[PDB]
Amino acid sequence: AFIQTQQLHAAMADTFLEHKCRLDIDSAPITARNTGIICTIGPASRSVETLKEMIKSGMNVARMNFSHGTHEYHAETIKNVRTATESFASDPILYRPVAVALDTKGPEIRTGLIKGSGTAEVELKKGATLKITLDNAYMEKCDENILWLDYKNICKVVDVGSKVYVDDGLISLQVKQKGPDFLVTEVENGGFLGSKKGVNLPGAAVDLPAVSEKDIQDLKFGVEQDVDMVFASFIRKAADVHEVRKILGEKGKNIKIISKIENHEGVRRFDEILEASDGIMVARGDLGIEIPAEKVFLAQKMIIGRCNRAGKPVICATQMLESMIKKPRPTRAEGSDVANAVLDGADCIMLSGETAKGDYPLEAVRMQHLIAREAEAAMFHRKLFEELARASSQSTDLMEAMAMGSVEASYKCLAAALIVLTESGRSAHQVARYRPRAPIIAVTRNHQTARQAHLYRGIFPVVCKDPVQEAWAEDVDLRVNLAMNVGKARGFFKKGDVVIVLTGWRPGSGFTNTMRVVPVP
């Protein structure tokens, strides 16, 4: 017979078990890819020529990691991202908006530099003694006997018996003795130690500021450089989010704050954090050191579920395709991890070392793109929609009603897209929350709306640069036709397919109160 595209046979299952049993490797996914791809920029991906290829390969958001680098460095990276992005601007039908994200240092603890003498890294051997010092005379003279770190109040928050993790939690030490300003430890889990490695104190109430003087400088720079969003590190409570918001101030009021959940306190206080934030990142690197690694999937699924329920963006991050730093193909676990994040409901997925420093940045981007489309088709939309509807049923909001009606109609007629005209993005955000399988082409004259729309599953932002037409009906038609041309050019649909179109009836309509089923011309 005919093998339906986009796992549509599985779509019709009555139970989740039957849905899984019907998944078919010979069911081709659609062309559109709904899951946003966020790429960390670094030495491997920094050039204008590489960035153009990154955009072509699927990058939607460029992440600048302020744990390292000067303002000069980051300004140059941002410049290059914008040069690459605008190189495509001559064709408004094919131009893709690209967002810029600033990821804060936050309250990090780091070691110093390994001493010049001897091997490049020192071996910390199981059972050996290691003294932790705060004496700056050692800040560039760390070795197998004495380790300097930059957290001055460390002795006030740890106890005898405390565990100290170093280098992505790979080395572990146990505190044996406390001095006034030093710690005598025993190496519990040994390994080779390099310079400026991350330190975690999972047992401790670390008392560094949520927003340091450095972070304030960095956030202010972000406002000056017109970044679209901030990924705020180590958010523990709503008050931390409010602090970031206050620093961004009036000038930065439209910059979106994505709180990174990466410690136990952030998980415990998740609901209040979500309420205060514009979205969330599941920051799995630190999270899986701060809590037992075998528990991370619980936090990931809980956080993604709760964000989906709230209609707020959620990003899955860290080690998704880690082996691709050195290899041109991912492991089977990595393929599975990306697919399952998409199935979980992540709006965006992220690359870190894979794009920042790795040997195969373009291949990493391309692989996220391929896996995302497969997993998107494999979602159980009918059930997901019912469950989202149930969760939000206390709300009688009119835009939610239009969004739900439009998504339902899109399922029924297998629409090739939903076209949404929006200035603030809000109407498109509501459609995205209800998880259509078809792409959402959001036409906007607001350039920042376009860049920020990448935070939401399925929104394909399109910037309209045409002046406003005097007649509302003509201005609406102009923008709808732009989406039709974009969709055709991108291969999302062709003449004779059907799309759902959401518009405002009048210029003063406060949301898209008008839904049409329209054939593609």
List interacting residues with Na ion (CB under 5 A): 118, 422, 424, 426-427
- Residues 415-434: x where in contact with a second copy by CB under 8 A, - otherwise, as a string: x-------------------
Q: What, of Mn ion, a second copy, Na ion, none, does residue 286 touch, CB below 5 to 8 Å by kind?
A: Mn ion
Query: Can you tell me which of 9, 22, 115, 237 binds a second copy, judged by CB under 8 A?
Result: 22
Q: What, of Na ion, a second copy, K ion, none, does residue 332 touch, CB below 5 to 8 Å by kind?
A: a second copy
DSSP state of 469: P
- Give me the catalytic one of 33, 35, 40, 63: 63
Q: What, of Mn ion, K ion, Na ion, none, does residue 67 touch, CB below 5 to 8 Å by kind?
A: K ion
Structure token digits, residue 400: 């939610």
Question: Distance between CA 88 and CA 489 in Å, rounded?
Answer: 14
Assess contact for 433 and 463: CB atoms under 8 A. Answer: no
Task: Number of residues interacting with a second copy: please give it, by CB under 8 A.
Answer: 105
Q: Is 103 in the site for K ion (CB under 5 A)?
A: yes
Query: Can you tell me which of 79, 125, 329, 465 binds a second copy, judged by CB under 8 A?
Result: 329
Structure token digits, residue 94: 């094919």
Sites for a second copy among residues 264-283 (CB under 8 A): 264, 267-268
Is residue 412 annotated as part of the catalytic site, yes or no? no
Q: Determine whether the annotation assigns residue 63 to a binding site.
A: yes
Distance in Å, CB of 368 to a second copy, minimum: 9
Q: What, of a second copy, K ion, Mn ion, none, does residue 15 touch, CB below 5 to 8 Å by kind?
A: a second copy
Question: Distance between CA 445 and CA 344 in Å, rounded?
Answer: 32
Q: Is 3 in the site for a second copy (CB under 8 A)?
A: no
Q: Is 67 in the site for K ion (CB under 5 A)?
A: yes
Question: Distance between CA 418 and CA 325 in Å, rounded?
Answer: 37
Strands 129-133 and 182-189: antiparallel
- Give me the catalytic one of 110, 115, 131, 178: 110
Is residue 318 annotated as part of the catalytic site, yes or no? yes
Return the range that interacts with a second copy (CB under 8 A); candidates 13-21, 49-57, 154-162, 455-463.
13-21
Is residue 445 annotated as part of the catalytic site, yes or no? no
- Give me the catalytic one of 260, 269, 433, 437: 260
Assess contact for 134 and 112: CB atoms under 8 A. Answer: no
Alpha helices in 261-397 (DSSP H): 264-268, 270-276, 284-290, 296-310, 332-344, 353-356, 361-377, 381-391
Q: What, of Mn ion, K ion, a second copy, none, does residue 103 touch, CB below 5 to 8 Å by kind?
A: K ion
Q: Determine whether the annotation assigns residue 92 to a binding site.
A: no
Assess contact for 263 and 284: CB atoms under 8 A. Answer: no
Q: Determine whether the annotation assigns residue 269 to a binding site.
A: no
Q: Is 254 in the site for K ion (CB under 5 A)?
A: no
User: Which helix (H) or strand (E) element contains residue 502?
Assistant: strand 498-503
Distance in Å, CB of 107 to K ion, minimum: 11
Q: Is 401 in the site for a second copy (CB under 8 A)?
A: yes
Q: Is 297 in the site for a second copy (CB under 8 A)?
A: yes
Distance in Å, CB of 167 to Mn ion, minimum: 13
Distance in Å, CB of 146 to a second copy, minimum: 24
Is residue 35 annotated as part of the catalytic site, yes or no? no
Nearest residue to K ion, using CB? 67
Q: What, of Mn ion, K ion, a second copy, none, does residue 9 touch, CB below 5 to 8 Å by kind?
A: none
Q: Is 15 in the site for K ion (CB under 5 A)?
A: no
For residue 125, how many other CB atoms are within 10 A of its CB? 12
Question: Where is the chain discontinuous (C–N over 2.5 Å), named by the preceding residue?
Answer: none
DSSP string, 41-101: -STTT-SHHHHHHHHHHT--EEEEETTSS-HHHHHHHHHHHHHHHHTTTT-TTT----EEE
Question: Distance between CA 109 and CA 147 in Å, rounded?
Answer: 13
Question: Distance between CA 511 and CA 391 in Å, rounded?
Answer: 22
Instruction: Decide whether 105 or 369 has the Cβ nearer to a second copy.
Output: 369
Alpha helices in 454-503 (DSSP H): 472-490
Q: Which residues pair with 462 in a beta bridge?
A: 443
Query: Residue 4: CB partners within 8 Å, gap ≥ 6?
Result: 27
Question: Distance between CA 374 and CA 360 in Å, rounded?
Answer: 22
Alpha helices in 380-433 (DSSP H): 381-391, 398-412, 426-433
Q: Determine whether the annotation assigns residue 508 to a binding site.
A: yes
Q: What, of Mn ion, K ion, a second copy, none, does residue 481 touch, CB below 5 to 8 Å by kind?
A: none
The residue to which tokens 């000056």 are assigned? 224
Distance in Å, CB of 377 to a second copy, minimum: 9
Burial of 305 (0-12, 13-18, 19+ CB in 10 A): middle
Q: What, of a second copy, Mn ion, K ion, none, does residue 321 touch, CB below 5 to 8 Å by kind?
A: a second copy
Question: Distance between CA 431 and CA 295 in Å, rounded?
Answer: 32
List contacts with K ion (CB under 5 A).
65, 67, 103, 233
Annotation: binding site for substrate: 63, 260, 285-286, 318
- Residues classed as catalytic: 63, 110, 260, 318
* Binding-site annotation, residues: 60, 63, 65-68, 96, 103-104, 110, 197, 260, 262, 285-286, 318, 422-427, 454, 472, 479, 506-511
Binding site feature residues for Mg(2+): 262, 286
Binding site, annotated residues for K(+): 65, 67, 103-104
Residue set of the binding site for L-serine: 60, 96, 454
